[PDB]
Amino acid sequence: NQINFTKLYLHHTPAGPEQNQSAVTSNDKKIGLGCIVVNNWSVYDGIGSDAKLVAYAKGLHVFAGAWHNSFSLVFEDERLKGSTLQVMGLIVEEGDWAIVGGTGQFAMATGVILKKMQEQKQYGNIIELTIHGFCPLL
Amino acid sequence: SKLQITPCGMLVQGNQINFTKLYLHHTPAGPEQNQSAVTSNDKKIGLGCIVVNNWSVYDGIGSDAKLVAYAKGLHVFAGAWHNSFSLVFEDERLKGSTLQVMGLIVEEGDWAIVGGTGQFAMATGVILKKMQEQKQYGNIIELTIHGFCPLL
Amino acid sequence: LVQGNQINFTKLYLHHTPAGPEQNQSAVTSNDKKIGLGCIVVNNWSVYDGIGSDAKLVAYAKGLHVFAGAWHNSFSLVFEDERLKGSTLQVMGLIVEEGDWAIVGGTGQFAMATGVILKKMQEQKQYGNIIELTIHGFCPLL
Ligand SMILES: OC[C@H]1O[C@@H](O[C@@H]2[C@H](O)[C@@H](O)[C@H](O)O[C@@H]2CO)[C@H](O)[C@@H](O)[C@H]1O
Numbered sequence: 420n421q422i423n424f425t426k427l428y429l430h431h432t433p434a435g436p437e438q439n440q441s442a443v444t445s446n447d448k449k450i451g452l453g454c455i456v457v458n459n460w461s462v463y464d465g466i467g468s469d470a471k472l473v474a475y476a477k478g479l480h481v482f483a484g485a486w487h488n489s490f491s492l493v494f495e496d497e498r499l500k501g502s503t504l505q506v507m508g509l510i511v512e513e514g515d516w517a518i519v520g521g522t523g524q525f526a527m528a529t530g531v532i533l534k535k536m537q538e539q540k541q542y543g544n545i546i547e548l549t550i551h552g553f554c555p556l557l
Numbered sequence: 558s559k560l561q562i563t564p565c566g567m568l569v570q571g572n573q574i575n576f577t578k579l580y581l582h583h584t585p586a587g588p589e590q591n592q593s594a595v596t597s598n599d600k601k602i603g604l605g606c607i608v609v610n611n612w613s614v615y616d617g618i619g620s621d622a623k624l625v626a627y628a629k630g631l632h633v634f635a636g637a638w639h640n641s642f643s644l645v646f647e648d649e650r651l652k653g654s655t656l657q658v659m660g661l662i663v664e665e666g667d668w669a670i671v672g673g674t675g676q677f678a679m680a681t682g683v684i685l686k687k688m689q690e691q692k693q694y695g696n697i698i699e700l701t702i703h704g705f706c707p708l709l
Numbered sequence: 710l711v712q713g714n715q716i717n718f719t720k721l722y723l724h725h726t727p728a729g730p731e732q733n734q735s736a737v738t739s740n741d742k743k744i745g746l747g748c749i750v751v752n753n754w755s756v757y758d759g760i761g762s763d764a765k766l767v768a769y770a771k772g773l774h775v776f777a778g779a780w781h782n783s784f785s786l787v788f789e790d791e792r793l794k795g796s797t798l799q800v801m802g803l804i805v806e807e808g809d810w811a812i813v814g815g816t817g818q819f820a821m822a823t824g825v826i827l828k829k830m831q832e833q834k835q836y837g838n839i840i841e842l843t844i845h846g847f848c849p850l851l
């Protein structure tokens with residue numbers, strides 16, 4: 420049973436008036452790594468001005484030559500309130516992410532999340548998400 | 558290095574673990590404080606507080622309860638607290654075996670069992686959180702573990 | 710049952726270099742002297758296919774480890790070899806130089822990977838050490 424997900428759109432806003440993340444540490448000039456950014460990325464079920472918020476990407480990503488992400492994908496939907504998808508993986512804009520687990524309706528979830536740049540704005544960007552998850556919640 | 562690939566099957570409901578009545582002591586302050594914040598929230602954005610936690614876990618409530626594990630990891634504030642810790646057991650019958658836990662919210666909600674080591678290899682499941690007792694220096698959170706161990 | 714493949718890595722050598730000209734990590738927070746925890750280190754550990762000579766770089770351990778009485782790890786094991794370039798293994802667990810690690814996921818060739826990683830000390834150097842990694846995991850078919 421594969422989760423029939425619609426493509427989601429994660430709003431990664433590093434700065435600007437709608438900034439939803441912040442760096443708490445800086446990079447060491449000797450090594451070139453160490454920056455840690457805590458993020459509360461908004462996730463929509465579509466594109467456009469009438470796209471609705473369906474989830475949040477709450478967690479952090481650390482810079483070690485590449486960004487290692489670890490965040491909870493908590494669903495703000497009325498019927499899926501409380502249920503979360505646990506995501507861990509490398510790179511934010513491109514690449515893949517791993518579904519390392521989940522809670523509620525997505526208990527014991529497993530799968531991957533494909534990332535694709537969709538829109539580049541002045542103070543942020545939108546990342547298209549394709550979820551190939553499986554939950555044994557028969 | 559050497560990489561071997563062997564086709565097989567995975568029995569999801571292989572070994573089911575159902576440890577009930579486990580209570581985590583989340584103590585942000587006091588002499589028994591078992592965590593500490595190493596960053597503060599950004600005053601302009603409202604997030605960023607990273608806390609490193611060594612939460613003690615007991616097998617009951619009261620004076621007859623005994624410590625059975627430690628919740629060693631961290632939780633960061635990004636509108637809510639995103640957790641990531643190793644539930645390393647300390648009892649004799651489960652020494653060395655750990656449960657890797659990730660999920661949102663500390664006081665309530667649900668946590669995801671994303672893996673494990675030792676006797677809990679490849680473990681998947683969830684951990685249910687429920688407020689048990691609010692105290693002066695923190696609170697006790699009731700944990701309910703419902704996770705299987707697949708057989709390769 | 711779930712049809713898949715059991716992946717088994719042997720003789721992977723992780724470079725844990727806290728200091729020196731080849732230091733591959735850096736502490737970003739300090740330990741709280743009152744409680745005794747809180748040190749956070751961001752690590753880019755290199756993983757090789759052997760020791761000495763011209764051992765080919767095969768993977769990087771990109772992530773972080775925090776100190777809370779012990780070291781809790783969470784990182785992505787991204788491979789650099791041509792065949793596995795881009796594929797990752799998501800790893801979480803306690804202790805760096807010994808003990809066990811847990812495989813909580815993966816991408817690319819190791820999508821939906823689940824298993825454990827075994828650690829073992831190999832060479833202790835003045836500026837760091839080398840940890841031998843043995844991976845016993847399972848991946849569902851496609
Ligand atoms: O990946 C997390 C990291 O992204 C940095 O990169 C941004 C943006 O995300 C990219 O899409 C763009 O191509 O480049 C800029 C940087 O030049 C961002 O600056 C950081 O805040 C992190 O979120």
Ligand SMILES: OC[C@H]1O[C@@H](O[C@@H]2[C@H](O)[C@@H](O)[C@H](O)O[C@@H]2CO)[C@H](O)[C@@H](O)[C@H]1O
Pocket residue numbers: 583585592608632638662663664695696
């Ligand atoms: O969730 C970890 C986080 O909890 C904060 O909240 C504490 C306490 O845990 C709650 O039970 C209580 O309702 O509110 C207090 C804060 O007023 C705590 O402050 C943080 O240090 C973290 O441990």
Ligand SMILES: OC[C@H]1O[C@@H](O[C@@H]2[C@H](O)[C@@H](O)[C@H](O)O[C@@H]2CO)[C@H](O)[C@@H](O)[C@H]1O
Pocket residue numbers: 727734750774780804805806837838
């Ligand atoms: O585990 C992360 C932490 O490890 C330190 O390890 C060194 C040494 O390799 C260990 O054998 C010993 O137990 O502890 C020392 C330090 O006291 C390393 O120095 C740190 O930078 C971290 O990587």
